[PDB]
Amino acid sequence: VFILGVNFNEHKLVQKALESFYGLGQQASARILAKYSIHPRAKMGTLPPKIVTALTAELSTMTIENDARRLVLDNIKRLRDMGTYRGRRHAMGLPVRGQQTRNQIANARKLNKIERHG
Amino acid sequence: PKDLRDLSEVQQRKLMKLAGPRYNPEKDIIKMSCEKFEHQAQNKRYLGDLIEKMIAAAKDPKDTFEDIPLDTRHHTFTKKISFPKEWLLTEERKKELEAARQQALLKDA
Amino acid sequence: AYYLGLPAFGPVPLPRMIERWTVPKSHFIFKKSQENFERVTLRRLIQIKDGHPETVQLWLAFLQKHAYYGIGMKANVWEFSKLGVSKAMDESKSEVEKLLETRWEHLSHVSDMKGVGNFEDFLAKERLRISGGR
Amino acid sequence: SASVIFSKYINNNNNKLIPFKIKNSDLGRTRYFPP
Amino acid sequence: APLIKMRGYKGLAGGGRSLEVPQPIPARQRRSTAFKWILDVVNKKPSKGSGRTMFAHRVAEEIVAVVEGRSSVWDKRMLIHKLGTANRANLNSPALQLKGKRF
Amino acid sequence: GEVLVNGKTLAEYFGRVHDRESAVWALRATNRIDKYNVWVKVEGGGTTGQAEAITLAIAKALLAHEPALKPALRRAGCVTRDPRKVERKKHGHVKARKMPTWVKR
Amino acid sequence: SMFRAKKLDLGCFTNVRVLRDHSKRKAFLEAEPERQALRYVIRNTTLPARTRAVAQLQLTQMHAYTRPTQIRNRCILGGKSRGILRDFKMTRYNFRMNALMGNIPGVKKASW
Amino acid sequence: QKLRFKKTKKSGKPPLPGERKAYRKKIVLSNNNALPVPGLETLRPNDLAKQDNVGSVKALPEDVVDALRAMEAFKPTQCWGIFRQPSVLIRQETVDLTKKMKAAGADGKTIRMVIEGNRVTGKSLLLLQAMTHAFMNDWVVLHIPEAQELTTAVTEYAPIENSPLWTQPTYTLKLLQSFKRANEKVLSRMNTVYSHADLPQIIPVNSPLLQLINSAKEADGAWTVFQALWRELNAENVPGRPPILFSLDGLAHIMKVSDYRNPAFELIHSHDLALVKLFTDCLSGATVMPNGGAVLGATTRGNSPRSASMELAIAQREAEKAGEKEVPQRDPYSKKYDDRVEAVMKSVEILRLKGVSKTEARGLLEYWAASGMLKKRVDESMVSEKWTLSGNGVVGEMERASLLTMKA
Amino acid sequence: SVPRARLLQLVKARCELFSTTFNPEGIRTGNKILRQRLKGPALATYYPRKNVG
Amino acid sequence: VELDEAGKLAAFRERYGRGWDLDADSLTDLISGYATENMNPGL
Amino acid sequence: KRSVWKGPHIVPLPIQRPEPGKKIAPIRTQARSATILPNFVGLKFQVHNGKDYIDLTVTEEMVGHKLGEFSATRKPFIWGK
RNA sequence: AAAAGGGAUCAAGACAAGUCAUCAUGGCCUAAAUAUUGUGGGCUAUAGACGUGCCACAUUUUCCUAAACAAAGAGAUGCAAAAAUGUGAAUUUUAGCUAAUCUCAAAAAAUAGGAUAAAAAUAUACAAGGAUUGUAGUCUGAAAUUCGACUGCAUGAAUAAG
Ligand SMILES: Nc1ncnc2c1ncn2[C@@H]1O[C@H](COP(=O)(O)OP(=O)(O)OP(=O)(O)O)[C@@H](O)[C@H]1O
Ligand SMILES: [K+]
Ligand SMILES: [K+]
Ligand SMILES: [Mg+2]
Ligand SMILES: [Mg+2]
Ligand SMILES: [Mg+2]
Ligand SMILES: [Mg+2]
Ligand SMILES: [Mg+2]
Ligand SMILES: [Mg+2]
Ligand SMILES: [Mg+2]
Ligand SMILES: [Mg+2]
Ligand SMILES: [Mg+2]
Ligand SMILES: [Mg+2]
Ligand SMILES: [Mg+2]
Ligand SMILES: [Mg+2]
Ligand SMILES: [Mg+2]
Ligand SMILES: [Mg+2]
Ligand SMILES: [Mg+2]
Ligand SMILES: [Mg+2]
DSSP: EETTEOOTTTTHHHHHHHHTTTOOOHHHHHHHHTTTOTTOBBBSSTHHHHHHHHHHHHHSSSSSSSSHHHHHHHHHHHHHTOOOHHHHHHTTTSSSOOOOSOOOOHHHHHHSSSSSSO | OOTTTTTHHHHHHHHHHHHGGGGEETEEEOOOOOOSSSSHHHHHHHHHHHHHHHHHHHHHHSSSOOOOOOOTTTOOOOOOOOOOOOSSOOHHHHHHHHHHHHHHHHOOO | TTTTTTTTEEEEOOOEEEEEEEEESSSSOSSSSSEEEHHHHHHHHEEEEOOOHHHHHHHHHHHTTTTTTTTTOOOOOOOOOOHHHHHHHHHHHHHHHHTTTTTGGGGOOOOOOOTTTHHHHHHHHHHHHHOOOO | OOOOOOOHOOOOOOOOOOOOOOSSSSOOOOOOOOO | OOOOEEEETOOOOOSOOEEEEEEEHHHHHHHHHHHHHHHHHHHHHHOOOOOOOOHHHHHHOOOOOOOTTTTHHHHHHHHHHHHTTTTTTGGGGGGTTOOOOOO | OOOTTTTEEEHHHHOOOOHHHTTHHHHHHOOOTTTEEEEEOOOOHHHHHHHHHHHHHHHHHHHHGGGHHHHHHHHOOOOOOOOOOOOOOOOTTTSSSSSOOOOOO | TTSOOOSOOOSOOOOHHHHHHHHHHHHHHHTTHHHHHHHHHHHBTOOOOOHHHHHHHHHHHSSSOOOGGGGOOOTTTTOOOEEETTTTTTEEEEEHHHHTOOOOOTTTTTOO | OOOSOOEEEEEEOOOOOTHHHHHTTTTOOOOOSSSOOOOOOOOOTTTTTOOTTTTTTEEOHHHHHHHHHHHHHTTSSSSTTTSSSSSEEHHHHHHHHEEEEEEEEHHEEEEEEEEEETTTHHHHHHHHHHHHHHHEEEEEEEESSSSGGGTSSOOOOOOTSSSSSOOHHHHHHHHHHHHHHHHHHHHTTTTTSSOOOOSSOOSSSSSSSSHHHHHHSSSTEEEEHHHHHHHHHHHHSOOOOOOOEEEEEGGGGGSSEEEOOOOTTTTEEEGGBHHHHHHHHHHHHHSTTTTOOOEEOOSSSTTTOOOOHHHHHHHHHHHHTOSSSSSSOOTTTOOOOOOHHHHHHTEEEEEEEEOOOOHHHHHHHHHHTTTTTSSSSSSSHHHHHHHHHTTTTTHHHHHEEEEEEEEO | OOOOOHHHHHHHHHHHHHHOOTTOOOOSSSHHHHHSOHHHHHHHHHHHHOOOO | OOOSSSSSHHHHHHHHTOOOOOOOOOTTTHHHHOOTTTSSSTT | OOOOGOOOOOOOOOOOOTTOOOOOOEEOOOOOOOOOOGTTTEEEEEOOOSEEEEEOOOTTSTSSSSSGSEEEEEEEEOOOO
């Protein structure tokens, strides 16, 4: 089925589908299902076409999108523009939270950017 | 609390409530200490004056706290196990076993 | 305790108190070589029952005067008393004063001792200095 | 009569009687205990 | 369960090669080698169901395949027996009897 | 043949049939489970530690009633006291005997 | 330096940093109540905001010797700060050397 | 760049949906290797009520096993596939409970009972014997295999308009499908006597009652058909309406707040679920059964939460029966009680299950030995050994010590 | 099964009796600093003072 | 005027109130009044 | 002060607001842990980094941070030259 | 009872082995500085590379429920119950004990049930995993920015047993 323009398979859990959107986690997932009387173990192919449309209208009123990424990307961009310590660690791809840099800084070198994945 | 014979049943229970965690339901004793002062004589005097207030407050007919049930969550009650009295090999039980020992032989025979 | 008529029970062997320290045998680097140390405290318990309060204090006074070196002692004394402790301790003042008439000679100070200052604060601070901090 | 607080410490008497048992095993001499 | 084991002597077969020689093994060593082969075939098989009987039933099925002769452990038994027959003469090899007797 | 362990029944206490058979093995080996009632009181240790401890306890108590069973309890293994004990941890070792990784270079 | 007594009053192993740590212990003893008062006014959310801010500033102006966090035990025989045992006031090594000679009462080589 | 070594990157048909779950839930009720026990009798329609059958093992009829299997009376944790023919031990507790069901259905009354016991003492199987006595005597058995499937939020649920109740359509549908097969014979003899307006199909009065149940082909109208069916089975004055056995296993699950969430994200109480709200009413006596029957609720220890209200109620009912002037009371400072659980359990009867007697333990061991599954000499010395290792005859523990061992 | 407002009447009685702080709202009153006993004099005596020589 | 696009002034005032906000008020002389000449030697 | 209920960490600073259009000198501070308060906006600081005093001009985006977060103590690590 | 076990101890000599940065000491140097005091910073930097561990890569694992069984150690420079408050870290308030008494304090694995599977390779079925980062808090302490420890929410990297 389709929820907010994303296609999901029948054998997929409705909760795991909602939780696949950025910013939508366990708390929001449990409250969206409770709002429309969907048990956590509901599969995707069992939802009526009426409720599948209600979920799309529900997620459209939430901050679960690139919109949520902008909030995170803006916080990082601000740290750099101000000229703070943390901001300069994102730009150089270095650990930002006081980790030791002599060894084991792989994930920092790979993910720490100004334009992070999210 | 039962040593204070000048108190009534309702008043003795009210005293157990004011004591709070100082009351031991299993032994029925109110143990309370004091080391607030520099000299041991002063700690004894305080407890003496304090026990007089506990009794005066218990006699106060303003609020008997009968609505409040006695709270014993501060105490951890212990359950003791004892040897079963039905297993004691007495002259009466010996006859009981002889019957069971003999019925077993018949059932198999 | 027998001569004083005190029925004593024990000595009850209480559990041993064992401290442990593992230290390197060398002050400098060498760390793969350590050794264990300990300090085991051996202790006993003598409990007296149906003992008169005063008689129990003569027993304790006797043990302290003839204490054996290398032994530490601690006593917990019990005693039954009536209600009205405040008044009881005020009436016994005259009784204790008579017993001290001949004992005041131990202390002596210049008229209006000024080195003491605040009496209560002197005891509180002088007691800490005697005990080494607390 | 007596006090209740007093009676609550008399009943706690589950002591073991000193048996004065007779030794049936041979005992050696204790070690030399240095000072 | 195999009846023999292959022990090797270091550097006695030629240019750094070892001298493999068969030898018998007691019962406990025979059963241990056998059952460990069975567990090796079991662990490599894929999962089938769920519950607490997965591993148990997966092993029992291999025990039945062994008695029916259609198991894979029979190949490992014959493979080690071939090495024994192919090296039955090394029991009296000149190298095993001339260690330090050629001064 | 009623057996109690700390007030609880033999099955309510040991959740492992292997431990139940070992606790009363003396009575089983001599074929006297239905002749005596045992009231055990164990403390400390674990499930198997306590089970094997009751084996020796009942064996000794049983010999007080029928002293002529010791030759049988011998071959049953209920008279011997197993002295095995956990070895302490030793400095320089990860455990009683496990040593840390030794680096040659 | 103002907290260093002009007359040495140490009978243990004297050191440049032992005198330094002894001066901090004496300074904190003299200003612990004054310091506890400030730490109380700050954490008392029932007081006015200005009262809590005044005490928060005065606590920042007190000399460093008055802070208890700057007190670190040292060896009274060697003067080190690493490996000190509170029960003996000595390094792990001086504890070993004195324990084997019999200068620490009650201590003995352990074996079990 | 980095010069360290790095392990450079780099079978069978998979199972179908539901294949794995069906593997650990299938029930085997036979074993060709097992020996046929000689002299093994089959349960007659009135064998679970005779006092003389106590301590004897008898085989279940063939048609009963089809009905019990239809409503999931057997369970995988039970040892059925070790023997050839499903057989049960007629137990002194079976005769007691069964003699009450017999009198209840005959006098038109209703017994509201609760079964309690230790981990594995025969609670779930004592119902299997109650349902067995129900099928053989032409009753209407409505069994709920697992009460945790109604509370753990693992099935669809929808609200009812203008009411706090909640329906579970997908479960109610599956419940009707299994209700037909089990009671196919009894239902064939009954016809409708009321005019049900709202239904997936039009159904005139005096029609085959089995047709009314076949109307529920979709989950949506499943609950509506159920309520209509419930009205028919409980017809006030209609000849041919047999007693009803409304049984539920896992009572501890429906005696707390469920795991479902309402639109406000507040836990729904188990007694609000329309289906659970029906059983509790029948168990509390609120909903009367005009034709009579029995409402049995069996607790469980495997995967069961603790409800102080149910445990307190069970304790109070046993105290009143024994006649003790003092009955257990609430902990005046505990906040784990539930007023609604107390009201439902305020008049039920308790049936405590404990280990079997040494005479019953023999009849059960001889059945295992006759089947070649217990290679031992079944005598008093051997019965007392198993009776002791099983903790005074706990049937569940007696199987682990005799059947699930590694000595034979 | 007893109102909280009714229990406070008993909790307040104990405070008036044993002279303790009655703070049912859990307000941060800094009293944890008042109960903490000083440790200055215990630390000052660490290093032995100069003595006979 | 007084536009905080990043929301740092609103976040501060929400945590510590408007006592430290400039104007024309804990900042009257608490920070400046305590600043004395030669406060710390070495600038 | 991390915990919010204890307020921000304030330190004495010669923060005297100048007359409109007056030339005010920047504030030299070694208090690298002083929280930037809303009243610091518009002021010019010279935060000590251990050796030098790196200049800073407080803006509304810096409120809530520490002064030491704008003066690097170490120099970036660069391999080669 | 018994075919017991472990710990400590393990010499002289060599390695001009380690330590003149515990202490101590000969010679030689510094003595307005190679001595002494504070504020801030640094010892926490990071291309490549080498050692120790921790944890993970799901089917004997992990997750959920429940009414089992330990030993030893710690609290006068302090352990803190019960209750109440908070999703949580934790807070409010101190009963008792300076201890075989009171408190930390609860064992876990196990045992017995239960849930989940095309449990990652067919992209409409992306497993397990918890690094990285955003943000809101708590505790200790003048002080948590360089540079602390935990908590909530979100983010969801490599990782096919080498
Ligand atoms: N009357 C009986 N005849 C034969 N076997 C029985 C009988 N009663 C119980 N058993 C067996 O005892 C074991 C446990 O029985 P059962 O499952 O009914 O217990 P339970 O009380 O429902 O347990 P739980 O609390 O875990 O749900 C099963 O193997 C069962 O077959
Ligand atoms: K171990
Ligand atoms: K994990
Ligand atoms: Mg590395
Ligand atoms: Mg399991
Ligand atoms: Mg059950
Ligand atoms: Mg030597
Ligand atoms: Mg050299
Ligand atoms: Mg070397
Ligand atoms: Mg060197
Ligand atoms: Mg030197
Ligand atoms: Mg410095
Ligand atoms: Mg370092
Ligand atoms: Mg608590
Ligand atoms: Mg702990
Ligand atoms: Mg897989
Ligand atoms: Mg995942
Ligand atoms: Mg930080
Ligand atoms: Mg490896």
